[PDB]
Amino acid sequence: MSPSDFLDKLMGRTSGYDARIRPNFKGPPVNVTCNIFINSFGSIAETTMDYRVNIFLRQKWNDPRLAYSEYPDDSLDLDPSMLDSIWKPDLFFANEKGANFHEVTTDNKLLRIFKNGNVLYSIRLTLTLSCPMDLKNFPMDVQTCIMQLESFGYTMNDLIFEWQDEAPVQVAEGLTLPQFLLKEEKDLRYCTKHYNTGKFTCIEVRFHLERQMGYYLIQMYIPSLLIVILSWVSFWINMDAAPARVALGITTVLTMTTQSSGSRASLPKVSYVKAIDIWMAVCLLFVFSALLEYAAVNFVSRQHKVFIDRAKKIDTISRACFPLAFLIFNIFYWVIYKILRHEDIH
Amino acid sequence: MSPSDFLDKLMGRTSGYDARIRPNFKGPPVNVTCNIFINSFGSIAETTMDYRVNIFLRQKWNDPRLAYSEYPDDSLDLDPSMLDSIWKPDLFFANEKGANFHEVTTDNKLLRIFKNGNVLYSIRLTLTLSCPMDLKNFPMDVQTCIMQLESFGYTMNDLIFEWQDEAPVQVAEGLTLPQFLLKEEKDLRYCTKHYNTGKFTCIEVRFHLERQMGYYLIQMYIPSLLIVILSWVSFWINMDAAPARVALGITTVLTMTTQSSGSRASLPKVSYVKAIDIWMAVCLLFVFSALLEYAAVNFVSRQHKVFIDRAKKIDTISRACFPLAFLIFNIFYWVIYKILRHEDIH
Amino acid sequence: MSPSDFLDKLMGRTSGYDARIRPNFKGPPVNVTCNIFINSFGSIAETTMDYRVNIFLRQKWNDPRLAYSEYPDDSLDLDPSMLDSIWKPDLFFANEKGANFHEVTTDNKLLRIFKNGNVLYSIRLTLTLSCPMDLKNFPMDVQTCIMQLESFGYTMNDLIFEWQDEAPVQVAEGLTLPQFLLKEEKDLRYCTKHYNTGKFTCIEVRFHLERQMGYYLIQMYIPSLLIVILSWVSFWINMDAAPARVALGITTVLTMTTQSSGSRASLPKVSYVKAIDIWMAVCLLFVFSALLEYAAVNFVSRQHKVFIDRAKKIDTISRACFPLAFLIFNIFYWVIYKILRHEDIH
Amino acid sequence: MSPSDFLDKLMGRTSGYDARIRPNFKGPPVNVTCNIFINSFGSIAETTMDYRVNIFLRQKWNDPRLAYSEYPDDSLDLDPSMLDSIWKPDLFFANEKGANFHEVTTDNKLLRIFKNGNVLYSIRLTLTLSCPMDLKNFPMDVQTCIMQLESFGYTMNDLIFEWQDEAPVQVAEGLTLPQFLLKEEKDLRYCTKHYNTGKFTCIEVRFHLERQMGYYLIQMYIPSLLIVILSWVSFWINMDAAPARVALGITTVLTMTTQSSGSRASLPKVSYVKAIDIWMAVCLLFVFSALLEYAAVNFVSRQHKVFIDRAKKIDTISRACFPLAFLIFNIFYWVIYKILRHEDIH
Amino acid sequence: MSPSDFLDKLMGRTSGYDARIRPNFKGPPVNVTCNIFINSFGSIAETTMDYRVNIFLRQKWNDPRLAYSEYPDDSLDLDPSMLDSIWKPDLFFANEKGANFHEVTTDNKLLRIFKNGNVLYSIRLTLTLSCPMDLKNFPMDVQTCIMQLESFGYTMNDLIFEWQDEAPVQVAEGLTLPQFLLKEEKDLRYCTKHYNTGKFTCIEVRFHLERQMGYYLIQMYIPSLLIVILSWVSFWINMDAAPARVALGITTVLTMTTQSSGSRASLPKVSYVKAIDIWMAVCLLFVFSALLEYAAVNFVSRQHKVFIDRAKKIDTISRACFPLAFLIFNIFYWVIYKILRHEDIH
């Protein structure tokens, strides 16, 4: 009746329970059903290609040696300090770079035991998980982060992991990300590792994150468009003001180069072309073409009177031709980069 | 009479005390009253959306098995090394990203036991707590940091947390923050977590922090206003000095772009518009309009004499119209951003 | 006679010594005298408002139960591994953000026991201590760092800390700081904490640090003075060279703005005005006034001959008036900021 | 038959097994065969000259005292908590700056014991390994990272390490690096340490990494080439526009200096010349020569008419001579830096 | 004969060996001879004034109680897990800011015991050691790093440290440093600490590091020399081109200021003058003098014809006088900073 003697009667030397033996030795494999609650989600860094998460991991399995029939209550929520005295699955995260438990006050490790021997085991973890990021279409990209739960020491004939049938991944209410939107749907997949040591169980969960475009509109696109429009001002300046137009061209080209360099400041040094790179390259080509247009005008207007009329015609043609070509480029760029974004994330 | 035998007579194998059993087993839930002393408060980072605090956490509860009637003194302040031999609540901080205890010399873990079994337990902690920050109205914003104290392994029928009736949150005297002002009032709320594992107790405390505006006046607003005034100098320069006025416009526009980029250097990449963004955008529009005004003057004054008088009229009109419009914008901006700040923090 | 049996005869089950009981139970409080040797001193960061120190902490007290009369030698320097078997004071550092012990080879924890029971206990620590910094007069400021030694679990009726009468704070010979000068005198004060848990002993030591001005002369003051002198060159250029003088004014103003922004790069975002801020503001006002002077000259000289003579008079007056006013400002600035520095540090 | 008594019958006080004695005491040395699975590979930093890896390390050896003949199954995959009760080799990584084990849930330490006493021991590690990098030919370099497995406490007469005959190094499928390509072939070598303490076994594995050139084309080469082409525009401007051409030369030279400084931002301060340094130096020489060409033209054209024709001839010659010389330099540079890259990596 | 009983017969309760007593109690002090193997050497940071090293530390002493006469072999290389059961010296590093042991696989702690009781104890450590750096002559300086090995708990009458007579400091073959050259000779000195707690043994080793000058030639000296040569181009431009020459002077002065600021980017904020500071100051003075020369020419040439001839004479004199004075300064600077470097390092 007392609780103290029941605790060590269930598991102990008198009971003969061995925590080094899985519940069904030399029998069917242990079936562990897992679910995850995401308390926080952030620190998504493209430079290191990883993200930090904080979760409650819940594992449920069955231990026949832990079945009791004395206490009337079906479930026993006991003290989370006898985890060392019972068998537990050897779960680990395959793509984890860094993981830690939480020891604030009492370690966060809930354990409930049912009448039939069902064990529920909940533990709070902080993980840093690697995420290979495809940075093509970078300002308008969608990334897929994965989380793999794998057995390290037991093969498929001893330990099998399964996702819970209902709500395997829950997210804390009000969880928002400053840079990304987390899609409501989450993919559950069956990884299965094959090493030279054998076959090991694995379960995978995939989160989809869409980058928000407002910051890049404020920071990169609008300043570059302003530089292009500023370079167009040269066409309305008197053709005899050589220092003015030449300085306009120089400053616009150099500023465009600086902005192109700065657009990849917080990104890994990937060796393919991104969407922002295409935008910056076209803007640089536009400002360079404006400077070359003035160079042609200056060269033509001193060939001595059709040489003056020809330069005036070049300026008047450019005044309308540059914005029209830029508008056509903008239409094509935005249409094709909002059409690629209609490709299925899967 | 001796202290040594009393210490292990109160809790030990002879006494039969079990630290794995809560004080009132199969009875009413344990009522733990908590209070907090804030020793330090700082490291408020908008990029990571967290703040670091150092606290003394005091928990008081009642243990009937710990009631004694031998020693005359009502309270016993004993050695803080037998915390492992008594039951303690499993408190944890829900929004904590990182927590640590202090082990300098002797671990800081005071324990007092009263005659009636009242236990007072004080522990020094350093916490990093996540704070979701609303950066709209950024230079003139007010943030609300929260701290949640929650039970991990016990449900509401076993463990209930309550704030102390008098002085639940105390702050160290002379505690100041370089960037923020901490409001005297603190909000105490009742969170209550509902997971698939059950219902768990929670208590919340909210601190209000008002950002001080002096640094942003020195660093961002005044330099931008100086750039705008500098761009106004062009209107008083001779209209024939094309390189001078064109260079003025170019340099002011490029400097304005650089300042706008630098105004978000230490901020998260949020995708909404802040107050400083509106200010920078309007200043950029003003300097761009000054350059376009000179472009119009230069184009008009060479159409050949009303063409010269018209350009002179444009310059004389701009000389008065630009500062007046800027003053009207300043009045509206500051009035509406000191009117929004009158909205109740709650 | 053997040492091995004497070691556990002094403290052990046979002796009846209890390490959980203070030396004079139910009697006068234990008087612990402390002294500190500073091995290193550095990492003074204004952004985080803390400094890192490395110390040897020596505590001396009396334990009557540890008095022996067998060995002829008065002092016994024993192995530093039986610290767990004797009572020790629960000292801690109130303003410490981070502390660590040193475990290189054998842990650094000397223990000597005298014939009369006097215990000397020396331990090597590394501390990060918070220092609230008053950054007014920043380039020519004097800071006061404090170190508080406080009892966590014992009140004044059980434990009292005192500084040693002679040499309570010693500094390692040749200890220098790259940015600061450490004053020879150190202040010893009596803090005493009053919480809702009671009254706790505290002792405080204050170090005074004077910032050295050579780096700021090389880095900030001289470049700004050079920019001001460069802006004065405009007064000697021909008044018809509008692009030259206008470009001089623009570049000087923009460079002054950049230097003013950079002068607060490694400082916390405080919301008051510092001395370097006043210097930068006055230099910016000077260069802006030079540009406005040229704007006035350019406007006046085209009003058509007294209009040319008047502009020449303005230039000739400015040539002498600008350096004289700057010299007067320099005299006042340096005099009042070397007069404020004569205020007593206490 | 029971597992519990078999576990401590194999190794324990009853068996007489001593974990402090190697399997063949006073006999032939223990032959440990090792293999490695690389789970992740990244964080290759030139500044610190190290790279971070995550591996599964598998060691196989023979322990005659662990041979059993009771259980029918040839292999026993037991609980990974009795590693302390058996002898294990003292492997360590010679070039490791930082190493850590993984304790997520159950520590990742698989152990299998065969009928004949063969022990297979697999452990998950995260290593930071130093890599001395030869940065000559930096944008087009190939680096060789090494990993050394060495015995610390046993000499060659007690412990010998060998690579597994088949698949000693496996890489996870889909493992990619943002900056480098990892060559399929891996070199296996026999290091052998000779200290004053004796001779110690060592085995080495070498990975070859080729840097991808796309990022440096986008970031460094193309902007510099654009600056050079921009400097060529001066030759087509009217020779009387002195401020325009002089400003072109100044801006191109200063931008070239800034790009040369920025090309070594994320590199160690090595004291030899790299390929990117040669490219930047030649580009700087080209833009400086363009400015000096205009200086010569300006000086010649005012010697007063053959002085005007001579300056025109200089400009017309430069118009064709500068791009031709730059093209010849580009041909030579790229040919010799894609010829050096044909040198055998070994 | 068996090894297992011999291991605990040598040290154990049966033997009576006490690890808390030094080998010769109440006798002559223990003489520990030390030597060091440097596996790696790097991370020399001037900002924090420290360097990181990785070493094997070998200590040899004599323990009479450990002398055996049973096993025929003179030396026993036993398992490195019984270090807790024998006495060891309490060595520590006086100038260490951070130290860590290596626990990869089996902890790296070799122990050999000889027939006569000689103990050899080797341990792998990673240290961060503070190094006070004299940054006068910074680009061409030589630094001296020290390493102190000191006893913490034992005085000179109990424990004495000595360097090994032959090869006390060995360096791994092929050890190179990107920024420094490590001199072959190493100084061995006798520190001896005198505290208020007594006299403590210490041994010191000094390494000499010479900074390599190639990086600073590429990064700082050559760009500044190019800026000076660029400023000399103004003397060959027509004296009537005021915007061109004035812009040349402005850009050269501002770029020189920026380079002077950037030359101390990765250095502590010391308050004395370095060699690079002298170089930058003289270059800044040269470019400022060129601008002032043009200002004088512009002022003189409009005093209205001897006023034109005088300005032409000033320009022609400057054309030869500026490079000659710069060459003389270069000769003096390099001669005296390669003469100071001939001072003996000791």
Ligand SMILES: *[C@@H]1O[C@H](CO)[C@@H](O[C@@H]2O[C@H](CO)[C@@H](O)[C@H](O)[C@H]2NC(C)=O)[C@H](O)[C@H]1NC(C)=O
């Ligand atoms: C774990 O789940 C697996 C899969 O459902 C179970 O394996 C099945 O067991 C039933 C009952 O004995 C057999 O009829 C099936 O043929 C098995 N299928 C496979 C693929 O093995 C297994 O028994 C479960 N383990 C436990 C302990 O209940």
Ligand SMILES: *[C@@H]1O[C@H](CO)[C@@H](O[C@@H]2O[C@H](CO)[C@@H](O)[C@H](O)[C@H]2NC(C)=O)[C@H](O)[C@H]1NC(C)=O
């Ligand atoms: C903890 O506090 C709760 C709330 O005051 C107590 O619950 C009440 O107990 C009284 C006395 O038995 C009952 O009359 C009330 O109906 C209870 N209310 C509720 C909502 O449960 C509880 O008894 C306290 N626990 C202890 C150990 O004193």
Ligand SMILES: *[C@@H]1O[C@H](CO)[C@@H](O[C@@H]2O[C@H](CO)[C@@H](O)[C@H](O)[C@H]2NC(C)=O)[C@H](O)[C@H]1NC(C)=O
């Ligand atoms: C610790 O120091 C205090 C202060 O000197 C001692 O308290 C005094 O003790 C003497 C001797 O009994 C009394 O006459 C005084 O009245 C006490 N003064 C106060 C303010 O308490 C105390 O006894 C010392 N403790 C020990 C163990 O020696």
Ligand SMILES: *[C@@H]1O[C@H](CO)[C@@H](O[C@@H]2O[C@H](CO)[C@@H](O)[C@H](O)[C@H]2NC(C)=O)[C@H](O)[C@H]1NC(C)=O
């Ligand atoms: C480990 O491998 C070595 C090398 O194969 C073995 O050494 C050989 O052992 C055989 C059998 O006794 C001898 O005939 C050879 O002369 C040995 N060669 C050398 C170079 O020593 C060694 O026996 C193996 N160890 C074990 C325990 O099997």
Ligand SMILES: *[C@@H]1O[C@H](CO)[C@@H](O[C@@H]2O[C@H](CO)[C@@H](O)[C@H](O)[C@H]2NC(C)=O)[C@H](O)[C@H]1NC(C)=O
């Ligand atoms: C450690 O070394 C010291 C110095 O050599 C030894 O001290 C000497 O011991 C000899 C032999 O007894 C004496 O003759 C000398 O007078 C001692 N000199 C000094 C300065 O003390 C010491 O004996 C050595 N310790 C051991 C255990 O051998």
